[PDB]
Amino acid sequence: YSWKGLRAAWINEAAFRQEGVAVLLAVVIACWLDVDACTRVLLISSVMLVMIVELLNSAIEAVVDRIGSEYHELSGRAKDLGSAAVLIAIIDAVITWCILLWSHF
Amino acid sequence: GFTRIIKAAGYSWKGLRAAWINEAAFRQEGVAVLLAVVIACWLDVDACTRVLLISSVMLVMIVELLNSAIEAVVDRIGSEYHELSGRAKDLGSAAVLIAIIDAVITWCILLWSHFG
Amino acid sequence: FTRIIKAAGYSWKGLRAAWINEAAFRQEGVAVLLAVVIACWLDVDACTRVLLISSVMLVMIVELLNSAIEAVVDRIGSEYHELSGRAKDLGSAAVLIAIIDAVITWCILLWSHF
Ligand SMILES: Nc1ncnc2c1ncn2[C@@H]1O[C@H](COP(=O)(O)OP(=O)(O)CP(=O)(O)O)[C@@H](O)[C@H]1O
Ligand SMILES: CCCCCCCC/C=C\CCCCCCCC(=O)OC[C@H](O)CO
Ligand SMILES: CCCCCCCC/C=C\CCCCCCCC(=O)OC[C@H](O)CO
Ligand SMILES: CCCCCCCC/C=C\CCCCCCCC(=O)OC[C@H](O)CO
Ligand SMILES: CCCCCCCC/C=C\CCCCCCCC(=O)OC[C@H](O)CO
Ligand SMILES: CCCCCCCC/C=C\CCCCCCCC(=O)OC[C@H](O)CO
Ligand SMILES: CCCCCCCC/C=C\CCCCCCCC(=O)OC[C@H](O)CO
Ligand SMILES: [Cl-]
Ligand code: NA
Ligand code: NA
Ligand code: NA
Ligand SMILES: [Zn+2]
Ligand SMILES: [Zn+2]
C-alpha cells in the first residue's frame, strides 16, 4: 500500500518527485526561518497537501487506464478534474507562502 | 522541458470548466468559497488566521474536484456496466461534507476568538 | 433546498457505510473526537486549535476519498477479474502522507506550547 504506492509514485510520476523535493525544501526552509509554530506548520502542511492531492490524482488516473486506454469523454473528464484539483492545491500553497512571507521576509 | 508544465496547466483549466459546466455542487460551493476568500483578504486579522480562513475554504473546492473526478469514473463504468451501487459516490459526498464542516468550524473558532 | 437534503443523505449514507466496513475510519472517527476534546481542553490560541483539529480532519477526508477509489476498483475487479494494486496503493499513500502531516502538526504546535 502506502509505502508501495509512494515508491510507485516516485519512480513513475515526475511531478511527484518535484513535489517531494518541494516538501523537503519547505520543511528545511520553514525550520530555518524565525517563525512561530502555526506559521511553520502552515508552510509545511500546505506543500504536503499538494503531494496528497497529487497521489489521489495518480490513483484516479490508474483506475481510468485500467478501465481502458481507449478514448472516452468521461475517461478524460476524470483525469482533467483530478488535474484541476492539484492546481487548486498548488494555488493554495502559493497564496499561503505569500501571505506568511510578505510579513516576515 | 518547461513546455509540459503548460500541457498540465491546460488540463487543469479544462477540468475546471468541466466541473463548472457539469457539476452544480461545484458552482454553488465555488460561489460561497470565492466569497469567503474575498472577505478573508479584507479582514483585520494576522497572517496565520488569514491563511487558515482561506485554505479551509479552498480545501472544499479541492475535495469537490476530487469528488467530481470519482463521479466521472463511476459514470464511465456505468456506460459499460448496468448496475451501480452508488457507494463510491456516497463516500465522495461524505468527503465533501467533512471538508465543509471543517471550514465552518475553522471560521467559527477563528472569528469568535479575535472578534469575541 | 430539496437537493441539499438529498446531497446530505448521500453524505450520511457514505459516512455510515465507511464506519461499518472500514475499521481505520472508526479509529479516525475516534481520533477526531479526541483531537477536538484535547484542543478544547488545552489552553491554546485559536490558530493552533484550528490546526490541531483540521490536521486530523484531513486524514478522515483523504480516507473517505480513498475508500471511494477502493469501491470503484472493486466494481471493476468484479467485472474484469484483475488484481493490480496501484490505484489502491496510491490512495493508501495519500492517507499516509496526511497522517504524517498531522503528526508533524501536533508535534510542532505542542512542542511550542509546552
Ligand atoms: N483515456 C483518455 N480519454 C480521454 N482523454 C484522455 C485519456 N487519457 C488522457 N486523456 C487526456 O490527456 C490528459 C493527460 O492524460 P493523463 O491525465 O493520464 O496525464 P499524465 O499522467 O501524463 C500528467 P499528470 O500526472 O501530471 O496529470 C488528460 O488530462 C486528458 O485531458
Ligand atoms: C511565492 C512563492 C512560493 C513558493 C512555494 C510554494 C509551494 C510549492 C508549490 C508547489 C509544490 C509542487 C511544485 C510544482 C509541481 C510540479 C508542477 C507539475 O505538476 O508540473 C507537471 C509535471 O511537472 C510535468 O513535468
Ligand atoms: C496574494 C495572492 C497571490 C496569488 C498568486 C497565484 C498565482 C498562481 C500561482 C501558481 C501557479 C503555478 C503554475 C501552475 C501549476 C501547473 C499546473 C497544474 O496544476 O498542474 C498539475 C499537474 O497536472 C500535475 O498533476
Ligand atoms: C461564531 C460565528 C461565526 C460565523 C461565521 C461562519 C462562516 C462560515 C464560513 C465559511 C464556510 C464556507 C463553506 C463553503 C462551502 C459551502 C457551500 C454550500 O453548501 O452552499 C449551500 C448551497 O449552495 C445551498 O444551495
Ligand atoms: C462569511 C463568509 C460566508 C460565505 C458564504 C457561506 C454560506 C454558506 C455557509 C454554510 C453552508 C453549509 C452547508 C452544509 C450542507 C452540506 C451538504 C452536503 O453534504 O453536500 C454534499 C456535497 O454537496 C456533495 O458534492
Ligand atoms: C469545535 C466543534 C467540534 C465539532 C465536532 C467535530 C465534528 C467532526 C465531523 C464528523 C465526525 C463523523 C464521525 C462518523 C459518524 C458515522 C455515523 C455512525 O456512527 O454510524 C454508526 C451506525 O450507528 C452503525 O449502525
Ligand atoms: C499529544 C497526544 C495526545 C494523546 C491522544 C492523541 C489523539 C489525537 C489525534 C491525533 C493526533 C495526531 C495523530 C496524527 C494522525 C491522526 C489520525 C490517525 O492516526 O488515525 C488513525 C489512523 O487512521 C490509523 O488507524
Ligand atoms: Cl471493519
Ligand atoms: Na457525456
Ligand atoms: Na455529482
Ligand atoms: Na477499505
Ligand atoms: Zn499521471
Ligand atoms: Zn492526469
CA distance C51 to C48: 5
All 3 cell numbers of residue B74?
463511476
Q: Cα–Cα distance between B99 and B26 in angstroms, integer? A: 13
Q: Which residues contact B82 (CB under 8 A, 6 or more apart)?
A: none
- Specify whether the CB–CB gap between B18 and A66 falls below 8 A: no
User: Which of B58, B63, B74, B90 has the most C C-beta neighbours within 10 Å, making it the best mutation to test the interface with C?
Assistant: B90
For chain C, what is the HEC assignment?
A: CHHHHHHHHHHHHHHHHHHHHCHHHHHHHHHHHHHHHHHHHCCCCHHHHHHHHHHHHHHHHHHHHHHHHHHHHHHHHHHHCCCCCHHHHHHHHHHHHHHHHHHHHHHHHHHHHC
Write the CB contacts of B106 (distance below 8 Å, at least 6 apart in sequence).
Answer: B52, B53, B56, C50, C54
Comparing CA positions, the residue from B38, B57, C58, C94 lying closest to residue A41 is C58
Q: Resolution reached, in Å?
A: 2.7
What is the distance in angstroms between the CA of the first residue and the CA of the last residue of chain B? 52
Atom of ligand 4 nearest to the CA of B116: 1
By residue count, chain C amounts to: 114
CA A42 to chain centre: 14
Residue A73 among the catalytic residues = no
Using the beta-carbon criterion (under 8 Å), do B73 and A84 form an inter-chain contact? no
Total residues found in chain B within this entry: 116
CB B47 within 8 A of CB B37: no
- Find the residues whose C-beta lies inside 6 A of ligand 3: A 15, 54, 57, 83, 86-87, 90-91, 94-95, 98; B 5, 8-9, 11-12
Which domains does chain B carry? 1-116 (1.10.287.3610)
CA distances from A29 to A91, B78, C8 (A): 19, 47, 41
Q: How far apart are CA A40 and CA A96, in angstroms?
A: 11
Pick from C67, A82, C69, C77: nearest CA to B81: C77
| Chain A residues inside the 8 Å CB shell of B16 | 84, 87
What's the maximum distance between 2 C-alpha atoms anywhere in chain C?
55
Helix axes C46-80, B47-80, angle to 10 degrees: 10
The experimental technique used to determine this model is X-ray
A residues 29..88 contacting C (CB < 8 A): 36-38, 40-42, 44-45, 48-49, 51-53, 55-56, 58-60, 62-63, 66-67
Assigned C-alpha cell, C22: 472500514
How many angstroms separate the CA of residue C79 from the nearest CA in chain B? 9
Query: Cβ(A52) to ligand 2 under 6 A?
Result: no
The span from the CA of A56 to the CA of A62, in Å, is 10
Ligand nearest to the CA of B43: 5
Contact C108 A45 (CB under 8 A): no
Helix or strand or coil: residue B44?
coil
Give the residue, out of B31, B67, B91, B93, with the most ligand 5 atoms within 8 A of its beta carbon, to mutate for a pocket test.
B93
- Dist. CA A72 → ligand 9 center (Å): 9
